[PDB]
Amino acid sequence: REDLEDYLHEMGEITASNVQNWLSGRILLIENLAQTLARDHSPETTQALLEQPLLGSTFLFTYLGQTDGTYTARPTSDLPADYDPRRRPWYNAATSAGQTTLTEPYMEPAIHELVLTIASPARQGGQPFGVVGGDLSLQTVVKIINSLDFGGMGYAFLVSGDGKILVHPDKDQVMKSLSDVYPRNTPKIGSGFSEAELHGNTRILSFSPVKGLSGLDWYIGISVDKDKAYAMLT
Numbered sequence: 001r002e003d004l005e006d007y008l009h010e011m012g013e014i015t016a017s018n019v020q021n022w023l024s025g026r027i028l029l030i031e032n033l034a035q036t037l038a039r040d041h042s043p044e045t046t047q048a049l050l051e052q053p054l055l056g057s058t059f060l061f062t063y064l065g066q067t068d069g070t071y072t073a074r075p076t077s078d079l080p081a082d083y084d085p086r087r088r089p090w091y092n093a094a095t096s097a098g099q100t101t102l103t104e105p106y107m108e109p110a111i112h113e114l115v116l117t118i119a120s121p122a123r124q125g126g127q128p129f130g131v132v133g134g135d136l137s138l139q140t141v142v143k144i145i146n147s148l149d150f151g152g153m154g155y156a157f158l159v160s161g162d163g164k165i166l167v168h169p170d171k172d173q174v175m176k177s178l179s180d181v182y183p184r185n186t187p188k189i190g191s192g193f194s195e196a197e198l199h200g201n202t203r204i205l206s207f208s209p210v211k212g213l214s215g216l217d218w219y220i221g222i223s224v225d226k227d228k229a230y231a232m233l234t
């Protein structure tokens with residue numbers, strides 16, 4: 001029957017769970033770094049803390065955007081001379097969220113590529129002195145969304161609650177609304193399964209929410225080829 005619906009539900013929960021566990025470990029570093037900088041954030045200690053093998057191999061750039069405009073980042077790169085950390089989208093994201101949150105994908109100014117930033121408000125007893133941040137390329141996340149093994153029948157993407165596709169294997173549909181990519185019979189966020197057409201291919205979409213992301217309701221979208229998926233086992 002439509003036990004394929006049961007398959008898309010389990011794969012959606014497993015993917016959403018694997019993305020949560022993947023982001024939890026990286027959030028652990030930024031919080032551990034923000035709490036250490038809360039105890040000491042002198043340029044001597046901030047330098048030694050920002051350059052360590054665990055942070056360097058995990059994020060493209062690990063940095064502390066201070067409250068007075070001071071910026072320290074590892075590794076260093078070419079940023080505009082008027083670079084103010086407080087005008088950055090990751091600075092206001094951690095401030096408005098009041099906790100460790102994820103930024104929607106934006107253009108990284110140094111390497112010119114889509115990245116998602118983990119950011120925490122660095123405070124010492126409700127007195128914020130800066131915002132700690134770490135950059136994850138959108139390409140890394142896309143690889144983690146599709147780490148599960150499909151039968152070549154579909155893929156998996158990340159979409160927000162409002163319908164804006166965050167990370168996606170197709171670079172075109174990134175940051176575009178769910179209505180833009182699917183103009184007619186736009187899939188609905190949440191349960192259940194929706195039918196749509198993309199590039200002349202009948203597609204079935206399912207959405208499983210990413211549990212555990214404080215401050216965000218992000219859904220793992222699973223878009224599978226309808227005809228290719230109905231090739232079932234015995």
Ligand SMILES: NC(=[NH2+])NCCC[C@H](N)C(=O)O
Pocket residue numbers: 061063073074075076077078079088107108109110115135
């Ligand atoms: N010194 C650096 N290379 N910093 C790079 C990280 C900056 C951060 N991605 C931003 O958009 O503001």
Ligand code: NA
Pocket residue numbers: 152153154225
């Ligand atoms: Na396909």
